[PDB]
From a paper:
The protein is comprised of two domains—an N-terminal MACPF domain and a C-terminal β-prism domain. Pore-forming proteins (PFPs) are a major class of soluble proteins that oligomerize into rings and undergo large irreversible conformational changes to become transmembrane assemblies and breach the membrane of target cells. We have identified and characterized the non-Bt insecticidal protein Mpf2Ba1, providing mechanistic details for how it effectively kills the devastating maize pest WCR by forming pores in midgut membranes targeting a different binding site than the insecticidal proteins currently deployed in commercial transgenic maize hybrids.
Upon incubation in gut fluid, an N-terminal cleavage after Lys25, as determined through Edman degradation sequencing, and subsequent oligomerization step are triggered by interaction of monomers with yet unidentified midgut component(s). After gut fluid-induced oligomerization, Mpf2Ba1 monomers formed higher-order complexes that were isolated via size exclusion chromatography and imaged by cryo-EM. By fitting and refining the X-ray structure of Mpf2Ba1 into the pre-pore map, we discovered that we could model the entire protein in the density without breaks, except for the 30 N-terminal residues, five residues more than the 25 identified biochemically. Upon N-terminal removal via gut fluid activation, these contacts are lost and residues on one side of the MACPF domain become fully exposed. The MACPF domain in the Mpf2Ba1 pre-pore remains mostly unchanged, except for loop Val52-Val57 that moves from an external position, in contact with the uncleaved N-terminus, to a buried position in the oligomeric structure, as measured from the accessible surface area per residue. The pre-pore β-prism domain is rotated ~15° clockwise relative to its position in the monomeric structure. This slight rotation disrupts the only interdomain H-bond between MACPF and β-prism, involving the carboxyl oxygen of Glu137 and the hydroxyl group of Tyr460.
Residue numbers in the entry:
A (entry chain L), B (entry chain M), C (entry chain N): 31 to 484
The structure:
């Protein structure tokens, strides 16, 4: 009887596809049916190939990743494992942890809370005899790889993986992933704290005193965030009970992870080894390593870089009540451009465009206010509504310029801010336009603020 | 005893016919009865051919695909699998996920929510010895393929498939597919969020707090969308219970998927391999690969491109009450062209034509308003009803031009918008015609808006 | 023990006779008693000939076909299977899905809702060794076919079929076929939506919320349509329970399909192969293929083309009450030709003739109104009743021309439309005649509208 996980160690792995999942590896490079076995010291009746070192490490454990923005989350994710380079490792998990719009939505900040239920971990040393344990066809394929063609190496890394697993933890994990509107959730605590506290709440691990302390903070987090939930290892008939809010259901799953563990986490010291560790020629290793970091890992990292949504069109709507509503394609900035100035209610509305590789639109890239009679600046559009309509004052018109999309300049968000002071502060990172949308009218000073993510 | 799924790995597959279904593959290329077996480490008493690598990966998992338009959904679907080129892969599933009119209806946006219930996954390496495992008649047929005739290669890809499966996940899946009127569903959340939340509601996975938060949003989604439901793997006598709204029925199905799993999903890293990987001559592979992407995959992708419905005829109806009703062939734009102007109620009505390959009609391609006495512009039709009938003012007449169908110019939708401002905003992507359908009359300004999908 | 369905794969098949039914195939071309067997991996204790590939695909599935007109339904039916050419494949099913008058009735639109209960599917590869498995007399008959006589080939395709089955799905199916009066059913949803929803209602699959949403729409669909119902596979003593409105009865049938499945659907990728794939001489294949598409498939497709009913005679009836009634041979257009004009009630009545191949009558092909004293136009008939009898005004008479039947010009329907506006709109695709049937009288303007299906 082989120890569970011997099938999963040595598996050829693609870092970018996913984190700590076997779906990220393509086929097993090493032959362990033929190899000499060793009995597992702590689990008599189970055997492993003598090359692997298996340590018991029974320990329920946390791995938490967070970032105020996706490009930050992608780096705190990538650095969660001892691995070389700045590449967006594990970043393929984004496509399944988070809703695709919510990755593109620049108002979100992201947290992933993973409770690993460790049981044991299998380790594989970097000794030169590893080559002798490869399956013959795998060794033959690697030995005949035509490293004189970049496409062959690139296909090899794609088809076989760039690394192979050398550190495995076998157990269970429950994960909660969440994206949270960072403009509107309560800031009393860091979102990782209320993320973890709400994860503990959903699993019932949150104590009576913590439940009171976090309990008011987690409701704000709960309503303003999209919590994806998943669970792995253990009895799938009990896996759905872990988020049942009841400790007996969570423990009933934990009591099943021991029977049927899965690959859930890496061993921090030696998670995986590069595939050219196994090739017999140093000149082959040089070509493969050179291709890996000169070409393949750059392209793979770039192909997992996520754009933000951007504004492509603005409109203004006017009417006699607070509840007037934009054309269906647009969404409304809820601050009245005549707030306190009387007259008509006026609202600024925008369209945010999803970026597309083959047909990016223009973004909006600049906005200006031109007032009474000044001509529209060269190449700007102008909205025909007077932004003091009914309010009196001077005639106010807003103009904006559109240009082909560039991440350096496509405006991601806009807002309107107003108050009694002329020197009013925009939200952090926003730039406000000069000129008052109630110039000459009564009421508040009002300014349009613009935000670019870069 | 062979492990379930050994019959399904190596199956020759057509990407375009469907996603993650065995109905998309035509016959098994590899002979695994003769081949040397290996016992499955985690399932003693089951065996596999020694070539395949089987990993346990017991993990309930989500794959979600969405798009504001079908051409977007077709690309988010195609990119849901690591596969080469921009072709409309898996796009044959459209014919069974969605109602055919609803694919043609440009007011719809599309979401597919799939919960895969994974159990294990079978992997097959790209080693050169695969050729030795092919069935002799399959190898003989591939070896004698007359690649000097494009029709022979095209028939081979059609009859045998262009790829073969190298990554298989065996388990269950429940799918909800929905098309939703994007003009009228609530925009509080992205439709993928309320799609997933309503899927969780139908399966009972939605929590008490999420049920409150989403519960008001999902009813709007529910009434304004056509949710197709299907389920695969597990006991077919319990499969219909999964959408019973009750967790005990859903779990009772999950508890049966473990006994009788099906091919439900791909392994993301190595889903399928090109068929010319197996041909012995590189000159044959060049001809097959060249034909695949120069001819066959283009034609197959194009033959899955979906037109939108288009307007081919307009009429106006007039009468003494709000509830007057068009001729049966037409449908009514519910905004009165004398709203606030008194007189007769007037409504604009249209026919939307289904596109046909052998007999496309004319579409409407331009609309104009000509008012009192100006002659009808060259080649335009004119509607005889005065669009201020009973309202006084100037005599208003609407004219439109029709031309043979072209996706670049066939108008897909029209609407009438009106309000107190002359500078009123059309819905996003609509173009409004110049001139007021109440010119000289009282009441609102009213304009006809036109939309082309391209 | 042979797997159920081995008798049905390889069966020589006629596409035109029916869809997915064994009654459409004439005798089995291949000998599988002698052939070497293979045990079915997923059903130990059942065997198949080693040539066939059997995949389990347990999946309850939908195939839906719809069209606003029969010639559209015939094409959406024909294209429901991957098969070559524009021929009216499967069109023989019309004679049993729909009432013959209702195919001829141009007011109907057609929907077929099929729920396939798949269990497994048998596949047969296009390998050259198929010829070796043919039964000797079948091979001898094909080898001696005198392809120098078109009648011999035509008789062979008629007697033996033009194709043979290569893809089989074994299971059950329940079908609802319906023809619906497209002029009078509610247009809130597409008829395929309320067809499917009412099918789900009859089988009990419609949910509580869908039952409310569709429930008012399905009653209109139900009363205005003729739903044929049939069921196939499973226990015939439980088959009639599937439309019992009760899920327990439907599931009780599904639980019996697993014991006694039938041929219910095709495998989409490889449904059937042309019969000249099996002939040994390419010169024979050329003659057979040339005959198939030059002669036989055209004639078979044409012999399944359905005419519409047409108007052959018109009469007018006059009297003192709304409820006056035509001569028994005619049916009445319910709009009074003196509506609002007082006097006598006047109604226009018509006879619609069934087309006959050996004795087509004249159709009506033109209609005119000649008023007071103008002579009857050359070759027109005239109705003697004044269409302002009792109403005063000018004397109104309707004239019509009859000509030998032609689908290009035989008028299929007529109607009378009236209202306060002179510029009133006819129903879509109708043409209204000039002149008012109340000219000089009071009341509404009234016009005769004519419709030709072509
Ligand atoms: Mg203002
Ligand atoms: Mg008007
Ligand atoms: Mg009259």
């Amino acid at each position: 009887t082989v120890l569970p996980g011997v099938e999963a160690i040595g598996l050829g792995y693609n870092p970018f596809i996913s984190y700590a999942s076997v779906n990220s590896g393509a086929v097993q490079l090493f032959d362990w049916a033929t190899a000499k076995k060793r009995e597992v010291p702590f689990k008599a009746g189970y055997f492993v190939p003598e090359i692997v070192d298996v340590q018991q490490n029974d320990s329920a454990t946390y791995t938490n990743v967070s970032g105020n923005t996706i490009s930050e989350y992608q780096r705190s994710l990538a650095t969660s494992v001892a691995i070389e380079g700045r590449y967006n490792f594990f970043s393929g998990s984004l496509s399944t942890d988070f809703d695709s719009n919510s990755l593109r939505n620049a108002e979100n900040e992201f947290t992933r809370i993973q409770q690993s239920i460790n049981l044991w971990s299998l380790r594989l040393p970097s000794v030169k005899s590893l080559r002798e344990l490869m399956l013959p066809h795998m060794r033959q394929q690697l030995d005949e790889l035509n490293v004189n063609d970049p496409k062959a190496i690139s296909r090899y890394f794609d088809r076989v993986g760039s690394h192979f697993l050398t550190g495995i933890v076998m157990g269970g994990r429950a994960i909660l992933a969440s994206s949270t509107n960072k403009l509107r959730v309560k800031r009393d605590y860091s979102v990782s704290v209320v993320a973890k506290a709400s994860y503990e709440g959903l699993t019932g691990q949150l104590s009576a005193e913590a439940k009171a302390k976090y309990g008011e903070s987690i409701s704000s987090f709960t309503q303003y965030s999209n919590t994806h939930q998943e669970v792995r290892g253990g009895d799938g008939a009990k896996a759905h009970g872990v988020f049942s809010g009841k400790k007996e259901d969570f423990q009933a799953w934990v009591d099943s992870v021991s029977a049927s563990p899965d690959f859930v986490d890496f061993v921090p010291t030696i998670p995986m080894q590069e595939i050219w560790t196994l090739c017999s020629s140093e000149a082959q290793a040089e070509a493969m390593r050179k291709h890996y970091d000169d070409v393949w890992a750059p392209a793979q990292s770039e192909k997992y870089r996520v754009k933000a949504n951007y504004i492509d069109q603005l409109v203004v709507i006017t009417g006699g009540s607070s509840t007037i509503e934009p054309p269906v394609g647009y969404s409304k900035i809820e601050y009245d451009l005549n707030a306190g100035a009387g007259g008509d209610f006026i609202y600024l509305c925008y369209h945010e465009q999803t970026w597309q590789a083959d047909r990016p639109k223009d973004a909006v890239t600049d906005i200006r206010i031109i007032f009474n009679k000044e001509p529209t600046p060269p190449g700007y559009t102008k909205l025909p509504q007077d932004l003091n309509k009914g309010a009196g004052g001077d005639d106010v018109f807003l103009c904006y310029k559109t240009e082909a999309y560039n991440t350096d300049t496509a405006i991601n968000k806009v807002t309107v801010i107003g108050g009694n002071n002329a020197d009013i502060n925009a939200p952090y990172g926003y730039l406000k336009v000069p000129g008052d949308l109630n110039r000459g009218a009564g009421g508040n000073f009002i300014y349009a603020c613009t935000f670019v993510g870069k």
